[PDB]
Nucleic acid binder design. Structure first.
Ligand SMILES: [Zn+2]
Length: 1211
RNA sequence: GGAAACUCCCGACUUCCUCAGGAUGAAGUUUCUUUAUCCAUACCUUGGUGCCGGGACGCCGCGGCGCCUUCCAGGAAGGGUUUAUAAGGCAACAUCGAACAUA
DNA sequence: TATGTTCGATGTTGCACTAGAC
DNA sequence: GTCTAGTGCAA
């Protein structure tokens, strides 16, 4: 038919296109002038693939608890976790730096008089120079250079020094310091023969520098300084940590709030140092330390060493230069404690395995931490300004300012004290307080500033959840919630009894109902039938659909008591459609059922009837599980009754009576609905606060009713990028005969790599060995290696595949095959389909195209909860080990260049999508004739619409234990979303066009459309952008040469700017405001909205219904009455509009509905999958759609095309 | 668009198409589709299918049956309706806010 | 405003080179 | 020649 590209072909089309993006073109250009292309300096993207790993059984795999334990070491902020220690370190008076050198200088702060020297430098050079202080000077000389920075030419030396000193390329400039670097650089080139020699001989270099400087001015001896600090260094070799006397120590403090202080402590110093950097970045520099570099020693050598030596006795006293008294030694005790507490690294090891250490996780750990640091620090600042910019009120002001100190001290801006744990507690409480008052705000506002709540202070967490413990808490939570449920229920009714305020138990509805219908309606007949409905519906709802005892039981009630016809009951109950009670003066009125004429039950009776029934199930529910389908239903009934029971009160309630008497442990937060307990008598408002128990009850109930879940532990370690290429040893390969006609394979036989079976069947493992050893580029056999039966596997992270012989080849990051030794039963086989596996190959054989990146090991332990001992107990089920391997598509390859000629206009039908293509060439007023037009199926859509209104139970799929809400709905949208973009992508290829899509305006369905737009159109928001780049392979924008478009921005207060034209850029899609794209006609070219407005601002229908317009003659029709009501239904043809309407004179509005009704007519057959008004015809007798018909999508598609086209009043 | 099915909901236990490549050929102006061995082993989704079960609607002589039409006396011309050539896949963690809806 | 559902979004990781000791 | 513990390099 018109079959579009899908799968690999579309991935190829999209990727190719990426390469044609504006940036990519730039990159290629750069290569001409640049010559060599950097992998990291060109467009790329990451494509992650997950492969479960087929670990062979008979492997020494650890218990999940053992696996679980480590993971927690890594991610939890409790004592015995890395986060604590890092926190302990700062808290307990220490500092972490990226390198060893910066550490030594810091400690020996005294030896280097940076303050004066800079002072002097300014006077003499008359400008402050970046990083030109003795302290920093020492590191620079001492530091080493890599890559092409090592080249020992005068120029390179100057280049580096320039950069280090923030000196700009000013050759012509006769700057005092600029000309000093040249002299210095020039005088350094001369006297040392390499950079490596410069580091070794660092006082000589220091000297020289001081010597040169001597000529310009009087400066102290750097080298002396260097020697001086050098003499006093006590620090362990390469320590990236140091102790500060100026620091404040806060040992033995709360784990929950420790993070708060360290950030605060560091933040405070940010100010002392008068740093120019952002606060967010100052702490990340100083906490984690620049790529986990600080922790590389600290987690491996600093940890080891800090357990083995004693705080004071080399004694960790002189090594870290502690206070001689114990002014600040309380500090070492807290960190010494932190180190032993952290368990030694365990059970994860490298190849030829030896255990991995905490230093191997520095990158990820730092990323986790710094992410939080960014977020938390941003909060405070938000908080402070948040603050800066009825006894309780008394409390606020008094208590408000104290909040400033909390925020300020937290932020490190107050040196009055370092924040107390209580400081923290106060903040929330205040939050507690402000919030109430805000509501009060709203309290008298509907009678007729924002003391709005303030945001939370962030926290950190992590580690596998304790499944059993959490479950048990729920169980106890549930028992207690029910228990206290009753008491609040019992007492309030009891209170009512004494004050005798109870309304008629069943009158309530009648009264309440009757209030709804604002009219006489005889005495009490019109409102009592509807009162009988209501009871039925409510109780009707609980058991409709369910197949439990109670549900069927309820059904029986309806059956025995004969409220409705059997057919009727079934449809309500069994088929699950239609309803017992219609809201009066219903706007939809979807054929309200007929309660049986015969039954003569009275409203008072039903409640007595129902009440009796209710009693029955209550006896029964006693024999069932709390977590049960039956109980679930009963609760539904119980709530209705209980509320109805509660609702029968005509007087307000005493606060002491209704106080929601539930302990705190069992619950957490009450929304704002419940922000009260002067003026607290609540007129029938106990219902909502009352509803809490159920909702609260429901949450725990859900958790315990969930049969399956999984817990996840994930690990990412530097250097975990090695995937292994192994041969399928057990198989015999019959190379096809026709393989030898190609020169390559011809070449293969000669090399004698191959080893045959007596039968002439190649043996893979044996042959594999040959290929490894035949000296040279392995690349010779890459083609064979791609054909030779092989498997991609991964080494067991816990055991040691030492290796005696070179079994297989192992592949790294940029394609780095390395003949390694693989043991038997030591590899895990990656499990995935062909396309997936193939990429893995490409990563090996073809690195420039794509290469492997660091992977993540994910261990999902699946647990399942089941009921025993009248409790829910969880038991471990299956463990799956998976590997997520990022694939970097360097791409950065070009093909035969091209551009978009046509345009793709897209419209979305609710049962698919429609398009229209226009040529770039036809840019004149006339001839905007669409090259092509059509529609595409896309079934998912109807599935989405048709499911959301059905409200069916979401598909059960394993959920993380952490997740407490269903994500089933989300995934589907993601899916539906995919197919929609696919087609557009598909269409795009054929027509070499770039799409134009309507801004949005079924609501579930809109969510997806919103998303679809994310993929093509340009948006700033990171989420929207991220989606796009995924599709277009990191591509940014494609600009069409020779075309451009008219833009119209705004200035201020919604004011029109100016019509400016610029070159046209498509991302690869652009947008158009679809204002009544649908109303207008594609062929006609005339909207109907014109007289719409014109007439509204300031009626001669004919016999068949003709109207005098400005632009033609609009012929409005009514339901044809030619053959009778019963018949069309007979064929199912929907009663077409062939019959005219002529009432002589019509209202302004009347035609509006008429025309409304008149254009988007519906479907030909009743048995359509379309309910939407799929068809629209231009009204004029002129338009060809009048007699013919069209699809709204195509039409709208066209208008859309045309409208956009006008814009590009460019060439 | 090739080949197929036939009213319409809600539920219950089975089968799995498609999939990335390598040396070939036979044809059809730098492409289109066929076909041989051969490596790649099939992950996560959206799905499809077979099956019972509980029901419903539109006719009809509590029960039979099921897309509308029309012509030979159960059969030949037409209409519609629905589709599988399946479709998608960038991971992870921690944080924060509320966000939509339904009558 | 009220009845029940749910996502929406920020921030971070998915380093690479080599002097000196294994 | 092999490896890892340091930390520079691009930003
Ligand atoms: Zn028209």
């Amino acid at each position: 038919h018109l079959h579009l590209i899908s799968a690999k072909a579309s991935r190829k089309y999209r990727r190719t296109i990426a390469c044609l993006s504006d940036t990519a073109k730039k990159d290629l250009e750069r290569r001409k002038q640049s010559g060599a292309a950097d992998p990291a300096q060109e467009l790329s993207c990451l494509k992650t693939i997950k492969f479960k790993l087929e670990v062979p059984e008979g492997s020494k795999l650890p218990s999940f608890d053992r696996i679980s334990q480590i993971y927690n070491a890594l991610e939890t902020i409790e004592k015995g976790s890395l986060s604590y220690l890092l926190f302990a370190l700062i808290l307990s008076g220490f500092r972490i730096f990226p390198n060893s050198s910066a550490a030594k200088t810091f400690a020996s702060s005294s030896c280097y008089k940076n303050d004066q020297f800079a002072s002097q430098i300014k006077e003499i050079f008359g400008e402050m120079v970046k990083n030109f202080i003795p302290s920093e000077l020492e590191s620079i000389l001492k530091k080493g250079r890599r890559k092409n920075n090592k080249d020992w030419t005068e120029e390179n030396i100057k280049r580096v020094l320039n950069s280090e000193f923030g000196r700009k390329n000013s050759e012509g400039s006769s700057a005092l310091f600029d000309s000093f670097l040249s002299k210095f650089s020039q005088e350094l080139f001369r006297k040392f023969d390499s950079w490596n020699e410069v580091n070794k001989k660092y006082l000589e270099a220091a000297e020289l520098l001081d010597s040169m400087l001597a000529s310009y001015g009087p400066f102290d001896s750097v080298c002396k300084m260097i020697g001086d600090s050098d003499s006093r260094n006590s620090l362990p070799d390469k320590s990236t940590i140091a102790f500060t006397n100026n620091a404040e120590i806060t040992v033995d403090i709360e784990s929950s709030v420790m993070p708060y202080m360290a950030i605060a402590a560091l933040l405070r110093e940010y100010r002392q140092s008068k740093s120019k950097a952002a606060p967010v970045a100052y702490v990340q520099s100083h906490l984690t330390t620049t790529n986990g570099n600080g922790l590389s020693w600290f987690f491996k050598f600093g940890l080891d060493l800090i357990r083995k030596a004693p705080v004071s006795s080399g004694s960790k006293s002189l090594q870290e230069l502690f206070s001689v008294p114990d002014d600040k030694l309380d500090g070492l005790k807290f960190i010494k404690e932190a180190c032993e507490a952290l368990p030694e690294a365990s059970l994860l090891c490298g190849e030829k395995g030896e255990l991995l250490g905490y230093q191997d996780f520095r990158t990820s750990f730092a990323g986790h931490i710094d992410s939080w640091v960014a977020n938390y620090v941003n909060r405070l600042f938000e908080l402070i300004e948040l603050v800066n910019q009825s006894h309780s009120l008394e409390l606020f002001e008094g208590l408000v300012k104290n909040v400033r100190q909390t925020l300020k001290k937290l932020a490190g801006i107050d040196i009055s004290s370092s924040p107390n744990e209580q400081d923290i507690k106060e903040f929330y409480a205040f939050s507690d307080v402000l919030n109430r008052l805000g509501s009060i705000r709203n309290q008298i506002e509907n009678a007729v500033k924002k003391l709005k709540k303030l945001p939370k202070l962030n926290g950190l967490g992590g580690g596998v959840p304790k499944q059993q413990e959490l479950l048990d808490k729920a169980l106890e939570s549930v028992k207690q919630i029910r228990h206290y449920q009753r008491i609040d229920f019992e007492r309030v009714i009891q209170w009512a009894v004494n004050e005798h305020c109870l309304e008629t138990v069943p009158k309530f509805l009648v009264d309440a109902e009757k209030k709804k219908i604002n009219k006489e309606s005889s005495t009490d007949f019109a409102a009592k039938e509807n009162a009988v409905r209501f009871l039925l519906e409510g109780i009707g709802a609980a058991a409709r659909g369910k197949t439990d005892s109670v549900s069927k039981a309820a059904y029986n009630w309806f059956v025995v008591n004969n409220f409705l016809a059997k057919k009727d009951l079934n449809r309500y109950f069994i088929n699950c459609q239609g309803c017992i009670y219609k809201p009066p003066y219903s706007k939809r009125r979807s054929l309200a059922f007929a309660l049986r004429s015969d039954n003569k039950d009275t409203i008072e009776v039903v409640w007595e009837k129902f009440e009796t029934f209710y009693k029955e199930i209550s006896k029964e529910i006693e024999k069932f599980n709390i977590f049960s389908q039956e109980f679930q239903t009963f609760l539904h009934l119980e709530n209705l009754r209980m509320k109805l029971l509660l609702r029968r009160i005509q007087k307000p309630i005493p606060a002491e009576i209704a106080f929601f008497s539930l302990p705190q442990e069992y619950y957490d937060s009450l929304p704002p609905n419940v922000a009260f307990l002067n003026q607290e008598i609540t007129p029938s408002e106990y219902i909502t606060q009352f509803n809490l128990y159920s909702s609260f009850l429901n949450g725990n109930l859900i958790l315990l009713r969930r049969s399956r879940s999984y817990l996840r532990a994930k690990f990412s370690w530097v250097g975990n990028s090695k995937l292994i290429y192994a041969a399928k040893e057990a198989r015999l390969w019959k190379i096809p005969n026709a393989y030898w006609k190609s020169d390559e394979w011809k070449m293969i036989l000669d090399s004698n790599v191959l080893v045959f079976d007596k039968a002439g069947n190649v043996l893979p493992a044996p042959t594999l060995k040959k290929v490894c050893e035949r000296e040279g580029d392995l690349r010779l056999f890459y083609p064979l290696l791609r054909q030779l039966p092989h498997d991609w596997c991964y080494r067991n992270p816990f055991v040691k595949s030492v290796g005696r012989e070179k079994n297989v080849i192992e592949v790294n990051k940029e394609g780095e095959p390395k003949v390694a030794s693989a043991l038997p039963g030591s590899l895990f086989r990656l499990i995935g389909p062909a396309p997936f596996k193939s990429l893995l190959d490409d990563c090996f054989f073809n690195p420039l195209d794509k290469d492997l990146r660091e992977c993540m090991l994910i261990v999902d332990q699946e647990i399942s909860q089941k009921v025993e001992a009248q409790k829910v107990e969880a038991s471990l089920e299956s463990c799956t080990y998976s590997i997520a391997v990022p694939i970097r598509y360097h791409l950065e390859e070009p093909k035969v260049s091209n551009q978009f000629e046509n345009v793709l206009a897209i419209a979305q039908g609710e049962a698919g999508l429609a398009y229209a293509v226009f040529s770039l060439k036809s840019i004149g007023e006339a001839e905007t004739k669409p090259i092509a037009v059509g529609t595409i199926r896309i079934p998912s859509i109807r599935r989405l619409i048709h499911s959301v209104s059905t409200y069916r139970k979401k598909k059960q799929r394993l959920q993380n234990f952490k997740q407490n809400y269903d994500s089933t709905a989300f995934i589907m949208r993601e899916n539906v979303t995919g197919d929609v973009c696919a087609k557009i992508v598909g269409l795009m290829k054929e027509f070499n066009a770039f799409p134009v899509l309507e801004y949005d305006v079924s609501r579930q369905l809109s969510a997806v459309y919103k998303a679809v737009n994310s993929h093509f159109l340009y948006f700033k928001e990171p989420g929207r952008d991220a989606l796009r780049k995924q599709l277009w392979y990191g591509g940014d924008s494609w600009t069409i040469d020779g075309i451009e478009i008219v833009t119209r921005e705004r200035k201020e207060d919604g004011k029109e700017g100016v019509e400016k034209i610029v070159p046209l850029k498509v991302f690869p899609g652009r947008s158009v405001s679809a204002r009544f794209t649908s109303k207008t006609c594609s062929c006609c070219g005339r909207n109907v909205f014109d007289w719409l407005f014109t007439e509204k601002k300031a009626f001669n229908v004919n016999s068949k219904g003709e109207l005098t317009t400005a632009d033609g003659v609009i012929q409005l029709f009514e339901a044809d009455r030619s053959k009778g009501p019963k018949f069309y239904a007979r064929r199912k043809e929907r009663t077409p509009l062939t019959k005219p309407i002529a009432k002589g004179s019509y209202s302004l509005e009347e035609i509006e509905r008429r025309v409304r009704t008149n254009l988007r007519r519906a479907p030909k057959s009743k048995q359509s999958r379309d309910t939407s008004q799929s068809q629209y015809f231009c009204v004029y007798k002129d338009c060809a759609l009048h007699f013919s018909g069209m699809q709204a999508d195509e039409n709208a598609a066209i208008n859309i095309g045309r409208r956009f086209l006008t814009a590009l009043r460019k060439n």
